[PDB]
Amino acid sequence: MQNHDLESIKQAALIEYEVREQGSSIVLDSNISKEPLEFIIGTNQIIAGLEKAVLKAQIGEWEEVVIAPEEAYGVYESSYLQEVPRDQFEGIELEKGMSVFGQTEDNQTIQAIIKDFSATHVMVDYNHPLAGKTLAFRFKVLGFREVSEEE
């Protein structure tokens, strides 16, 4: 029960995006300086992290969505094994594929997943700074317009 037009007709939704690093002034790529990108309502050909963002962004409103490296292009993963002595675990039982914890000297405790375990040594998955990092995909919905196959 609404007195509005028949929204059944397809439209050209223009958007613009810029992929920058967090904190750093450098830029990786941009289309904003080049020219905008039109698509039809429903054709989310963009990255999956931005697909869940574009539905929440309104017309004329800037939005900034930080995405992980494994959630954009996946070139350099953050999953590496580390050999740890069972001396660190003498009072706490272990298994393949459990969430384990590790108290650092920095008065903190990281969380990780065990890949293999024996009575001699244990092999735990951790991250490393040689991997990728988080990036800021900024974008805006420029807006949708009706278009025709003539002009």
Swiss-Prot record:
Domain-level remarks: The N-terminal region consists of two globular folded domains that contain prolyl isomerase and chaperone activities.
Disulfide bond residue pairs: none
Keyword Acetylation part of the UniProt annotation: no
One GO MF term attached to the UniProt entry: metal ion binding
Keywords attached to this entry: Chaperone, Cytoplasm, Isomerase, Metal-binding, Nickel, Rotamase
Source organism superkingdom: Bacteria
Endpoints of the signal sequence: none
Main location: cytoplasm
GO biological process, one term: protein refolding
The keyword Hydrolase appears for this protein: no
Entry similarity comment: Belongs to the FKBP-type PPIase family.
First-level EC class: isomerase
Protein name: FKBP-type peptidyl-prolyl cis-trans isomerase SlyD
Stretch of the intact protein here: 1 to 151 of 185
Stretches assigned to the PPIase FKBP-type domain: 1-99
Enzyme Commission designation: 5.2.1.8
CC terms in the record's Gene Ontology section: cytosol
Encoding gene (name): slyD
Higher taxonomy: Bacteria, Pseudomonadati, Campylobacterota, Epsilonproteobacteria, Campylobacterales
Provenance organism: Helicobacter pylori (strain ATCC 700392 / 26695) (Campylobacter pylori)
Ranges in a coiled coil: none
Annotated region described as PPIase second part, given as residue ranges: 134-151
